[PDB]
C-alpha cells in the first residue's frame, strides 16, 4: 500500500491491456518459422504492398503506445501541449523497444504476420540498412531477457522524460518522471535485476535509430500515402501533412 507499489501495478496493468500479443503466444510460436516458399512470396511483393502492411502494423503499434500513455497514472492530468510533446518524441521509441519481445535471439528472426522470419523477409522494402539496425537493436535487448514488467516500467520512462524540448509545465512532468524512476529501481531491486541498468541501450542509440525510422516512414508516406485509422487527432496532426 505505498503510492509507488500502486504505480508499478497501474503501469504493468496499462502495459498488459495494450501489448497486442501475450508473451506466452510469441514464445510458443518460435518453432513456427516461414519456409523458403513463403519468404519468396514476401520477397516477390511490391515495395509499396510491403509498405502498406508495415505502415498498418506500425500505426496500430503507435496507437497501443498512446493508450498505454493514457492509462499511466498522472499522464491524463498533464496539459495537452505536454502530452503531445512526450508522445511525438517517444511513441515510436517505445514501439522499437516493444519489438524485442517478438525477437528470437537464437535464430535472429521476428514474429511477423503469424510466423517467425529473418530480416531477408523485408527485402522488397529496400531499407536493408534500417531493417538491419532494427534487428541489431532488438538483439541487444533480447540478450537482456527483458521481462514484461521491465519493458512496462522502462517504456514508461522512455515516454515521461522532462528534458523533451517544448514542454510548458516542466515541474509536473518531473514529478511523474521521478515517481516512475523510483518505481523502476524499486522493482529492479525486488527482482535482483539491477544488473540490467549497465546493459540498457544509451539514450542516444535509441533516439537516432528512431529518428531515421520515422524519417524513412515519412519518405514512404510522401511517395505512397497510406489511409490511417486516426484515433488521436492532436498527435496525428504533428506527424502527417
Ligand atoms: C512519434 C510518432 C511517429 C508516428 C506516430 S507518432 C504515428 C501516428 C499514428 C497514428 C495516429 C493516430 O492518430 O491514430 C497518430 C500518430 N505515426 N507515426 C509514424 O511514424 C508513421 C507510421 Cl507508424 C506509419 C506511417 C507513417 C508514419 Cl509517419
Numbering used by the authors: 267 to 507
From the paper:
Nuclear receptors (NRs) are a family of ligand‐dependent transcription factors that constitute an important class of drug target. Within this family, the retinoic acid‐related orphan receptor gamma t (RORγt) has garnered much attention as an intervention point to treat autoimmune diseases such as multiple sclerosis, psoriasis and inflammatory bowel disease. RORγt plays a key role in Th17 cell differentiation. Numerous small molecules have been reported that effectively inhibit RORγt, which is transcriptionally active even in the absence of any endogenous agonist.
